[PDB]
Amino acid sequence: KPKLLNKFDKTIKAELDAAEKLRKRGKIEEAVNAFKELVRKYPQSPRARYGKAQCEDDLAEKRRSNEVLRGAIETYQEVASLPDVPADLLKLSLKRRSDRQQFLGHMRGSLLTLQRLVQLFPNDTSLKNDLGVGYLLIGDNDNAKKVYEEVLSVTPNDGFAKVHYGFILKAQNKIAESIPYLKEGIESGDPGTDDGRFYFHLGDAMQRVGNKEAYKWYELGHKRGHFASVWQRSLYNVNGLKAQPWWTPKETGYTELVKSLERNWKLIRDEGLAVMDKAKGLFLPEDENLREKGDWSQFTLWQQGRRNENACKGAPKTCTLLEKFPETTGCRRGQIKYSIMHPGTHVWPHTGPTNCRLRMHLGLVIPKEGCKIRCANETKTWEEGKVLIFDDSFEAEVWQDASSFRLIFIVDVWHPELTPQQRRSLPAI
């Protein structure tokens, strides 16, 4: 299908094929030197340069080397610099370049590449969609929004642009407006729309507006393999881990940590109240659009398995106590934090990002009435000095209708069935 040979490259097709056959047979190192020889002999050949890049790309995979991949990324660029590069090959080379830049975390580099692609191919809608993904990946939702608004002005029924536009709207708390874009986008079945993120946020958006069809989309999300169940909708998972909303200390095996939290709960409370009284600013408002209403702030001691030294100056004895429990201080997919919630607060139904952690709540200051937490089909209350344990990859909902503040201590632990190797290898969240 693709036309990759310009006029000169057609005259050396026998040599180009021989080198490419070496690559397709898995003789990567022989293919590198073969294409390198062709680049030496024919330094302007775009197909030879692309062959070199692809071989370097394969060599990077074989060696699992970022340095080798950086070489490939530059060679993909060289292809586009050569004279008389066929359009198909130019597009293939810069698209792989961008993709590999994203793989290495060179998001700004990928963005420049994607911008160049859209400039070279102004009518390729899929490339504009890719540019929007580049913006999303660096957290630039405003520019991502403009990209998809441009796509939809020309191709209003582009499903990929709809789901991503809906995703952006919901992230901006434009809940009602996001529902038709997310729904119509998924229903389009266009490549890239069968993605758990869009089922996740469509159902959540619907729950927020009182649309009872929310769970028909969680069920379909479950049927298509995006959710372990309609209740447990995390998207960064290790399959097979025991899945239940509520855990006992003994079921977790972390009984020593629970004992230490409950035996020493008053010193944890007291350092939290001291920060409340003398270092309020260490409590930061919840910033994930999870509240319908109310006031909810958190004072974080560990995140992504990293101690916040300055925060621990505000709770030094608590940080010292917890240092003995790497099952939580080393949980790179959880946090250790105080959480204050005030009356008039309602947290929408939601799930966390991963099934790789379990969440402990230690009650510190609990009004006698008005505070409760639901996980899956079961609602519970906190007790001062007592630990609750739940899996927040299951849907949770929270209410605070007391007449004074509610303070808890949150301690995330690795899921107990995760191996030591998994605990070291899983990317942080």
């Binding site: 991949l69 994203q102 990946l137 998207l235 994930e288 995140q303 990002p353 942080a428 969240i429």
Partner: peptide
């Protein structure tokens, strides 16, 4: 932005190559 209590970011993990 980080996914701490929810799942609101386009991606919750960082990209660091191999």
């Amino acid at each position: 932005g980080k996914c701490k209590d929810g799942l609101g970011e386009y991606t919750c993990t960082s990209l660091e190559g191999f």
